[PDB]
């Protein structure tokens, strides 16, 4: 459904190239997260099959109040907004990582990504 589809749009990029600052600034614009500029957004890479499986016990475990945490690790890239304005141009700093992720599932589909685990304040 629509929520799973939207999840894939702001949080999934199967095969990115260099996961650098330029990559971030480009995929953020591409996925329309630049008006206003999202403060931080993480993309998961890899195959969708593994992401959907986090909703089942095959690749996930219950987490906190109503989330699921993946068993396998995923390659990810977090784009963090740099600068004092929430309006384009949006400059982003990229951080490539590799760990498990936390999502919320709806009818067996990931519909939300808990991005808190990617922001080290």
Swiss-Prot record:
Any single GO CC term annotated in Swiss-Prot or TrEMBL for this entry: cytosol
Phenotype for residue 15 to E: In ALS9; reduced ribonucleolytic activity
Mutagenesis or variant effect for residue 78 to S: In ALS9; uncertain significance
Protein's name according to its UniProt entry: Angiogenin
Disease field: Amyotrophic lateral sclerosis 9: A neurodegenerative disorder affecting upper motor neurons in the brain and lower motor neurons in the brain stem and spinal cord, resulting in fatal paralysis. Sensory abnormalities are absent. The pathologic hallmarks of the disease include pallor of the corticospinal tract due to loss of motor neurons, presence of ubiquitin-positive inclusions within surviving motor neurons, and deposition of pathologic aggregates. The etiology of amyotrophic lateral sclerosis is likely to be multifactorial, involving both genetic and environmental factors.
Keyword Transmembrane helix: no
E.C. code: 3.1.27.-
Resulting phenotype, residue 64 to A: Abolished binding to PLXNB2 receptor
Positions of short motif Nucleolar localization signal: 29-33
Gene designation per UniProt: ANG
Effect the entry attributes to changing residue 37 to W: In ALS9; reduced ribonucleolytic activity; low angiogenic activity; reduced mitogenic activity; reduced thermal stability
Tissue specificity remark: Expressed predominantly in the liver. Also detected in endothelial cells and spinal cord neurons.
Domain of life (superkingdom): Eukaryota
Effect of residue 3 to A: Affects substrate preference. Significantly decreases binding affinity for RNH1
Activity regulation (record text): Has weak tRNA ribonuclease activity by itself due to partial autoinhibition by its C-terminus (residues 140-147), which folds into a short alpha-helix that partially occludes the substrate-binding site. In absence of stress, the ribonuclease activity is inhibited by RNH1 in the cytoplasm. In response to stress, dissociates from RNH1 in the cytoplasm and associates with cytoplasmic ribosomes with vacant A-sites: ribosomes directly activate the tRNA ribonuclease activity of ANG by refolding the C-terminal alpha-helix.
Organism: Homo sapiens
Alphabetized GO MF terms: actin binding; copper ion binding; DNA binding; endonuclease activity; heparin binding; peptide binding; protein homodimerization activity; receptor ligand activity
Documented effect of changing residue 38 to I: In ALS9; reduced ribonucleolytic activity; low angiogenic activity; reduced mitogenic activity; moderate reduction of thermal stability
